[PDB]
Design a protein around this ligand. Structure first.
Ligand SMILES: O=C(NCCCN(CCCCN(CCCNC(=O)c1cccc(=O)n1O)C(=O)c1cccc(=O)n1O)C(=O)c1cccc(=O)n1O)c1cccc(=O)n1O
Ligand SMILES: [Cf+3]
Ligand SMILES: [Cl-]
Length: 173
């Protein structure tokens, strides 16, 4: 395989004065961009949700809920606070096969409507990155959608690497 290079981290803003308590709760994935994200026209990606629960020790318990093969499935993982507020690493990284590196950075949010989060991982020696556009509801304005496209492009991703998952009612509500 070939891949679009991960951008340098200096091109990825960090949300100023991140407020971990305010960010918890359910977020819908209304946009998704990445070097392994690809528009499939015939089978469009379904919207999923991700729930952030802040723990006693200030890490997040993060649960994603998906509608796959007629059932809800739940992927749980831990985000451990990193170097600056709003950055995380993945907890228990040794329990993920082939995984050597994993970084999360909250790029911006207003907490009660929208967020943009950056992810970078190295698995089987390949460097993957993605940007997620989170919304407290399933719809978001054209202005936010365009802004996200603009941001995705600034990290080297073309239009065919950007997807807006289709809203669904099953599992995620
Ligand atoms: O390239 C990225 N993402 C787009 C492809 C997602 N996908 C297509 C859909 C898969 C369905 N699932 C996965 C849900 C279950 N979990 C996993 O099987 C998993 C295993 C090992 C490590 C890990 O971390 N996970 O999640 C999501 O829709 C889903 C929902 C919520 C959070 C989340 O993360 N995912 O993936 C891939 O499987 C894939 C294909 C090829 C390369 C690759 O890296 N991945 O992940 C990426 C770049 C940088 C950081 C990062 O976390 N990701 O995912
Ligand atoms: Cf992933
Ligand atoms: Cl996610």
């Amino acid at each position: 395989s070939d891949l679009i290079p991960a951008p340098p981290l200096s091109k990825v803003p960090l949300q100023q004065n991140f407020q971990d308590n305010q960010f918890q709760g359910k977020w819908y994935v209304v946009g998704l961009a990445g070097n392994a994200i690809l528009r499939e026209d015939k089978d469009p990606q379904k919207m999923y949700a991700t729930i952030y629960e802040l723990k006693e020790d200030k890490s997040y318990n993060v649960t994603s809920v998906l509608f796959r093969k007629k059932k809800c499935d739940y992927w749980i993982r831990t985000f451990v606070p990193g170097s600056q507020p709003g950055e995380f690493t993945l907890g228990n990284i040794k329990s993920y096969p082939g995984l050597t590196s994993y970084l999360v950075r909250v790029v911006s949010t207003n907490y009660n409507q929208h967020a943009m989060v950056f992810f970078k991982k190295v698995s089987q020696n390949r460097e993957y990155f993605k940007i997620t556009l989170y919304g407290r509801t399933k719809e978001l304005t054209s202005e936010l959608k365009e802004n996200f496209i603009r941001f995705s492009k600034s990290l080297g991703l073309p239009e065919n690497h950007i997807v807006f998952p289709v809203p669904i009612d099953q599992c995620i509500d």
